[PDB]
Each structure stands twice: as structure tokens, then as C-alpha cells.
């Protein structure tokens, strides 16, 4: 039997290849093609700002944080042009409610990231990875860390669980009208999304490239693997939350939490 | 630098021409997003590092999303197509096109009169706008927050909800 | 650099898409109530000032924390206003 | 190595194109779209002016200009909401009363 | 290389069309083996339950919607044939109007039968419909000498 | 520079009003009551008038590079505050008959007062922009308040697109000047190449929309017919009063305004504003469109003084007193129009043919409209005549013969429609805060009469304020 966890996803990709493509009638054609890469390329290029090595850095640009927020905001357009390209009021309203809770729960990550970039004081990722040299920026900011966790898992990572189905009748999940390679493109996109959120979390919250007794790149890789397993553990443990309860625990509870979080970090940093 | 600036400026020009020539709205929204991305590329090429990435997060990531919401919810595609193309003929496009072209040639003649004094792509970091925003310019920020409260209340008012 | 990685990514996109091709009116009560998203459109603009703020705070100091507290207090007053009037509530 | 004239004429071209889009079309959505285009053109002109002199004068009012754009687009979109809620016709000639 | 064949054996997407009865055992199986199954995304359709003349067009539209590589598992006597309902209102088997690949007798079959259905279907999927001049061997003929050699069974007065 | 207590005492008008918005917004979210919100908003604006005395204890000084606080700005803040006080007292009787959400009105007027008292204090081109837009957003939204009619929404949408268009012209002009000059500060500007002048012309377009000048006046009829009469009190008086201060300060400080290239263009706009106002104003039979037509001519008389600001120092007090007289005349006239709509009444039916009688219906209120309507024209015993007299003197002082002749012939043409409305209130006939609204317009009637017959005390205040 197959011994590797990734080989199942590999076979899934093989399966999506060589499948006949049908044209949709009474549909727009340019967005039907362009909507997959708005979901894929965003979290693909979210990987372009990680300091995997000082000598093998993929991009030595001055700002990486703002690019990450730009991808966070950009992701919504994939659910919107997918909703309009569904060309069925059912599916369109399903994607409208999915984009609703998406825009609703994407607010928190930037304000949660303000704490770590304020105690770091720079946008160049070399400064952040050199800041976590002895003390990581997770001990004081527990609330900011969990708020960024909720926000990162809330951006189309399936934790809300309103993507392929709809609690509300008169509408339907928006993953139905795509059946060619685009559905595999969606899955591989969320896969690079979860691994890139984990990598950004480890290299921005915890200390990357430390190397206590072993070479630091495999130290980063193993820590990323532990956070991968913990993310999968809590994603599976996380039950489906209906639309209402998600709206209830959104703007009410965590906007004050992040505002007092910014107050606490600004009071303690000086 | 020169070839990149020329090609992204021409991309912006072509996207601006495309958004003002088509009829279907969603194509126009896509081409306007392309134009905004080109403008952010111009901002990064000039050296305004805190502008190209600031435009996308807010100007091309929330407000245009609101435009997409309203054009999606009206469901105006599939209805009222023929008469808009009937009325918007090239002949009535020429009318104000030359009137705006007089303005264009006047501002080109005004701007070509000065010397060049060319500036390189100087990089401006966020460390100094964090001071200049907080130097003389604090009351601008405070009154802008009050401005945003004003926008919130006038949008709540004139977008009043009801039973329907 | 970033340009090389972008060229690689767009070349991979062209390779996958080309390979894929070779392989072979009235809404009534429905929708509406996007005003949570309009609240986001305004609140992202409010938080962009904190986006610019987060880079330089050590040289700002006590008046900076004071008027940042005033700013977020104004935002909090607006938020509780929208909550208490019934604008920010259950939405379809 | 690009001087100011190229960027300023680019901003002027986008300004003119946004004004033309504000003029020629009938749908209020399209006038708001051209309005936002021409606001962005003016903001581009301001940003190139601010970064021309090589100090931090371009990012100081650009944020507030896009704040104005956000508020104006929001009130305009709510006006479109209530206009289409009142009357199904979305032409500007429906609201063309008090002529002369 | 046969890598393409390996891809389809390793991973399959099931579309559960179990009807009024016979689906409680299928659910018993599915909740142990496995919101992922979606219309127009699956390549496997496990038709269970009695196929009726009135609702047969529904099954024909769902059969038409799926992609070019189509697999169908009939489970139960009510889906293989008309089963016990040889009546004016029941069509005598889902195989009358859609091709079927695997037949799982029983009324209702067991979850282990569903497991053996996936095993016989990956076996057919790994030989390329999958005849390949290897499927003439039949479960009636393969385990025949296994079944005939059974002599003693437990008396039915015990648990 | 940093914050000193001198800066806070100087900023006290912008502060009391901002604290009022917060308290009003908290009060709206707490109770959503009309009486409490009206009381809280009027108390804050009255507290801003009281604190004008305290900034008078402070001298002529800067707060930031954005603003300069002089005694000139003290008077302009006062004009804007009484207009805000005037509009809330006229809105309570109109909004008592409104069906729902009757409490957002004072919040928007308070934002507009912040915008008005920010254009009084100006020293940098950016403060000019933070002020224009702070006042427009309530004027974006308050002409669309009570959108249940078919014309309020119409008026709001026409003003919305056009005001955003003017702001985009102002911003593009604001940068094209800063390309030449190293700073956008008014004083630092101009330190006559065509790009600076070309940038200046774009700011004239973006400023002359809100000041209702001759090729931009098309909005002033329509929204004045469409908007509620309480909004028209603020839209006629406060906005243009606040806006005229910043456009005068730019030409006083900037050395580019000294050059004759901009001077000739503004004079022709002023010439045509008087003419293209006072000729199309005759045929109107609607009172709101009639006042909107007169507004174009009044801002034209202000411009014929402003062109001769640079010749003789009497133009400072001339602009100031005509603004004071123009405030009182329009507040009394627009208050009577709003006071006729004592309930909401849906669409108010106001017209020149609808104002037959009105002396045997309500005699006191007809007297106020007549006194103010004669004050708009140039009839003596009214403060408008003294304001008219200084602008004639300023034009004589600077030898602008075509411009002063335009005022006289514009006065000669414009006498006609003011007099019809004055006599049409004498043909044959076809709650507590309402008494308060009557008191405001009656108080203004007494003031314009006593400052027309006896105008010295107002001049003493103006020369006290001018630097
Ligand atoms: S096979 Fe058995 S359980 Fe299934 S539908 Fe037929 S009778 Fe019912």
C-alpha cells in the first residue's frame, strides 16, 4: 500500500489531468478561466517572502508584510468571479455569502500582525528573522497570536465550512460549476495556502534559523512540520460553524481584543 | 528601468482604454483592477515603496470589492443591453473627445515648458513617513478619522435598510 | 530575485494551461445587506493609518500613544454606535 | 532614469480618460467608475509630485485622498442602491427633472 | 509507465445516491471509511435502493453530468435487478438504462461488501471498461474451491 | 513643532466641536432620542462660541505648518458657528414630522462645522483639502437626508457627482503647482512660468464649483430646490462663507496672486458671475431657486472686492462686512421658508405663486422676509447696503471700472425679482421650538435693521479682527 501521506494528493493531481473540458452555455468565458489563478497565484506568491536562507533568499526586497496583506485582500476576488462565473443565482448567492464571511473574518490579521511588526520595527524580513534571536515574540502576545491564527485559518482554508455547501436554502456552494482541472487547481491552491500560512507563522512569530545543536534549515522544517500537524489536528477537531455563529463571534469579540492588544504592546514597548 | 517603466505605462494606458470601450460591466471592473495594479507598479518603480503596496490593500482590495458587490447584486447583466450600445455611437464619442483633447494638449504644452531635472528611483522607507505623518501632520490624521466617521454615518443613512 | 521567480511562476502557469488545453432580473428580497462589507471598506481605510503607524512608534512616544488612543476610541465609539442602532446585527 | 514629465503626462492621460468616461456614458455606476478612475489619476499626480522632491510628502495626503475616495464611493453606491430600489430604470434620464 | 492508471486506483471520489432504504448500511460504512462528495465532481456513483420508473430520469441526469470516465456500483438486489419488487411501478434494474461495472448482491449489503466493492473496482481500474482479457475470472469461479471445501458450521441454537 | 498649551488654546474651536461629535454619537447609540441629540449638539456649538473668547486671549500664531491662526480666522469661525446654530434650530421643526431615524441630522451638521472651522484656519494647501471635504460629506449626505421624495435623491446625486468632480480638479491642480515650488505652503508657494499658472487655473476650477462661479453655477438651482430648507440654510450660508476665507488667504499670501495673469481671469469670472446670475434670476417663480440664483450674484460681488485686495488695505474689511451682512440676510430669508414647513409635509410646496398673501396669514414672518429681501438688494437701512457700498469703494479704489459698473447694472437688473417677492407677500390671500425658530429669524431682523441704520459697531468688530 502507499506509505506516504502526500502520495494521495499526488494521485489526486494525476486524476484531474486528462479530463475532457466542457464549455458552459450562457456563461462568461474570461472569468471562467481567470478565477482559478486568483485563488492559486495569491498563496503561491505568498511564499515569495519567506527567509528560507540568508544566502538562498528568494527575494531580498524591502517590504514583505504589505505584500502579504495585499494577497489577503486579493483572495476575495477569486470567490467573487467564481460566483459570477457560476451563472446560477443559487451558486452566485452561495459565493456571495462565502465572500461575506470572508471579508468579515479577514479584518483581524493585519491588526494582529501590527504587534509583531511593531516590536520588530521593520518590514525587511532579515530584521524579523534576526529579531527572534533569544526571545520569541509569542510569550507576551498570546491574544494577538490566537487572533492571527483564527484569521489565517478563516481565509478560505475550509474552517468556516461554507465553501462547498450552504446553510441557507435558495443557494448552493460555488464549487459545483467547476469540474475540469480548475477543481484540482482550487485544492492545490488551498494546500500551498496552508503550508505558506504555517511557514509565515513560524518565521514571523517564532524564531527561524536558530540552530541550537543541529543545522537551522531542518530545524525550521521540523518546526513547520509540527505546526502542520497541529493545524491539521485542530482543523479536523474544528467542527463546521453555521453562518450565524460565525457572524456572532466576528466583529463583536476580536476588534476590541486587537485594539487593547495594540494598546498593551505600545505601553510595554516603551 | 526605462523599458520596464515604458511597458508598464503602456499597459496602464491600454487598460484605461479598455475599461472605457467595453459594455459589459464585469470586464470593465477587471480592466480597472488591472489599471490599478499597473499604477501600483508605477508607484514601486518611482520609489514610493509605501504607496504601491498601500494602494492594493485598501484602494484595490476593499473599495473595488464594494463595486463588485453592487454590480453583482443588481444582476444588470442580461437586461438593458441594446439601447446603451445604440446610444453610445462613435459619432457622439468624438464630440467630447476633442473637447477633452484641447485640455490634454494645453496641459502637455504647460508641462513641457519646464526643465527636466530628472530624479532617480529614490527609495523612501516607512521609517520617515512614520515621523512626518506624526510631525506637523497629526491633526490631518485626526480629522481624517472624523472624515471616515462622517462617511460611515452618511453611508448608513442614505443606505437605509427597511422591510424590503 | 523577485523578477526571476515571477517569470518562473508565469512560465509554469503558461505550461499548465497550455498542457491542459492539449490534454483535453429582479432580486426582490434576495441578496442585499452587504453593509458589513461597506463597513470593511471604510474600516480598512481607518486601519491603513495604523498600517503606516506601525513602522515608527519609538520616536513618536507619549503624545503618539495619546492621540492613537483617541483615534481608536473614536473608532470604538463608532462601532458601538453601529451595534446599538442595529446596523451591525444578523445579516442574510 | 525617468524624469517627471513622463509620469505627469501619464497621470494627465488617465485624468482625461476618467473625465471622458464620466462624460460619455449613461449608467450612474459608470460615472462613479470614471470618477474613481480620475480620482486615482489625481492621486498618481500627487504621488509623483511628492516623490519628485525626495522627501516624505507623497504618502501624507495620498492616504487621505483614498479615504475621500472610499467615503465618496460608499455614499455613491448607497445612492445607487436606493435609486434602483425606487425605480427599475437605471438611466440618468429617469432622474432628469427640473430642466431649465 | 502506467502512472496514469496508478493515479485512479489510489484515489476515487464517491457520489452516494442511496435511496429511502438500503442507505443506512452505506452510511454505516461511509462514516467509518471516511461533505467532500459533490455533484459534477465525482467519477464513482454508488447506486443503491430501488430504481423507480418515476425517478429514473433523475438518475439519468446525474449519470450524464459526471465526466467521461464513469464508474457505477450497483448495490442491493433492488438496484441490481428489480429485486423483490417485480411490479408495474419499478424498473427491473438500473442496468436497463445505464451501464454498470460492479454488482453487490444483498438486501441490504454489508459495509464489508462495500469494502470488497472498492477492492474489485480498483482491480478492474488497474487492468487497462477494464476487461483487458483478465476479468473473465469470476468470483463465482475464483473462490469455488474455497467454498466447496467447507464442511461444518456452527449450530444455530447458539450466539 | 510639538504641542504646547498655547497650541491647544488656539485649537479650542476645532476641539470642542470634535468632542461634541463623540458625545453626540455616543448619545445616539445609547438612546436614539431627538430631544437629547438636539440639546447636545446645540450645547457644543454654543460652547464653541464661548471658547472663541479664549482663543482671542491668544495672539496671532501657528499650530502646525498646516494651519495659521490669526484674528481674521476668529471672525470666520464665528460666522460658521452661527450658521450651524441657525441650521439646527431650523431643522428641529422640519424633522419633527419625519417618519424615522431623526437623529443623524445633528451628527452630520457637526461634522460640517468641523470642516468649516478648519478652512478658517489655513496655512498649507493640505488643510485646504481636509476642510473642503469635511464639509462636503455632510453636504453630500444631508441634501439626501429624507430621500423618500423623488427630488431629494435627485439633488443629492447631482451634487455628489459634481462635488467629487470639483475635488478631483482641485487636487490635480494642487499638485501641478507643487511641481515647480518646493513646498505647498501658501507662503512658501511662488518662491510666472506656465506650469505654476496652469496649476493655479485648475484650483480655480475646483474652488469655483463650491463658490458657485459662472461656468460652475449649474448645481446651485437644482439642489436648492431639492434639499430640505434646513439644509439650504447651511448650504447657502456656512459652506461658501467658510470657503471664501481660504480662497482669499491664498491670494493674499501667495506672491503668484500678485501677478496680473491670474487677476484678469478672476475679474472676468466675477464680471460674468454678476451678469449670468442677475439676468437668469428674473423669470423664476420658485423661492428656493430664487435664493439659489441670488447666491451666484452675491459671490460675484465678493470677487470684485477680492481682485482689488492687492490694491489698498480696505478690501480686507470690505469682504468681512459683506460676508456678515450676507449671512444675516440669507439666514432670515431661508428661515422663513423653512418655518413655513412646520411639519415635514413630504414635499414642501413653496413657490412665488404660493406666496401670495402671507401677511394676513402670518404678519410677523412676512415682515422678516421683506426686511431680508430688501437687504439682499441694496436698499438702505439694511446691512446689505453698507456691504454693497464697500465693494463699490474697493472697485473705485483699484480703478476696476468695468467691474464696478457691472455691480451697479447687476444691482439695477437684480432689483426686479427681490421687489416682486417683497410685494407678493401683500396680495390677496388665495410648538415650543417652532417659537424658538421664530425667535432666531426675528432676532436676525432686528440685527440687520439696526446695523443698516447704525453700522459702526460692526466695523469696530471687523477692524478688531483684521490683522
Ligand atoms: S436492497 Fe434491500 S435494503 Fe436496499 S432498497 Fe432493496 S429491499 Fe431495501
Numbering used by the authors:
A (entry chain H): 52 to 321
B (entry chain J): 1 to 164
C (entry chain A): 15 to 38, 60 to 127
D (entry chain K): 1 to 100
E (entry chain B): 43 to 76, 86 to 179, 190 to 220
F (entry chain N): 1 to 191, 199 to 437, 447 to 483
Recite the paper's sentences.
Respiratory complex I is a multi-subunit membrane protein complex that reversibly couples NADH oxidation and ubiquinone reduction with proton translocation against transmembrane potential. Complex I from all characterized species contains homologues of 14 core subunits; seven subunits each assemble into peripheral and membrane arms, joined at their tips and form the complex with a characteristic L-shape. The peripheral arm, exposed to the cytoplasm in bacteria or the mitochondrial matrix in eukaryotes, contains binding sites for NADH, ubiquinone, and flavin mononucleotide (FMN) as well as eight or nine iron-sulfur clusters, seven of which connect the NADH and ubiquinone-binding sites enabling rapid electron transfer. Here, we describe the single particle cryo-electron microscopy (cryo-EM) structure of the entire catalytically active E. coli complex I reconstituted into lipid nanodiscs.
Three conformations of the entire complex were reconstructed to average resolutions between 3.3 and 3.7 Å resolving the interface between the arms; however, due to high-residual mobility of the arms, the antiporter-like subunits were resolved at below 8 Å. The entire E. coli complex I was modeled by fitting models of the arms and extending additionally resolved loops and termini. Due to limited resolution, the antiporter-like subunits were refined as rigid bodies. Although relative arm movements were observed in mammalian and T. thermophilus complex I, their amplitudes were smaller and movement directionality was less diverse. Despite significant relative arm movements, the structure of each arm was rigid and did not reveal different conformations apart from the specific local dynamics discussed below. In E. coli complex I, NuoB and NuoD are rotated around an axis passing through the center of NuoH and the interface between NuoF and NuoG by approximately 15 degrees anticlockwise when observed from the top of the peripheral arm. This results in over 10 Å shift of four-helical interfacial region of NuoD, and its separation from NuoH. Rotation of the NuoB/NuoD module creates multiple openings in the interface between the arms. They are large enough to allow water and proton exchange between the Q-cavity and bulk solvent, suggesting that the ubiquinone bound within the Q-site can receive protons directly from the solvent. Therefore, we think the resolved conformations of complex I represent uncoupled states in which redox reaction is not coupled to proton translocation.
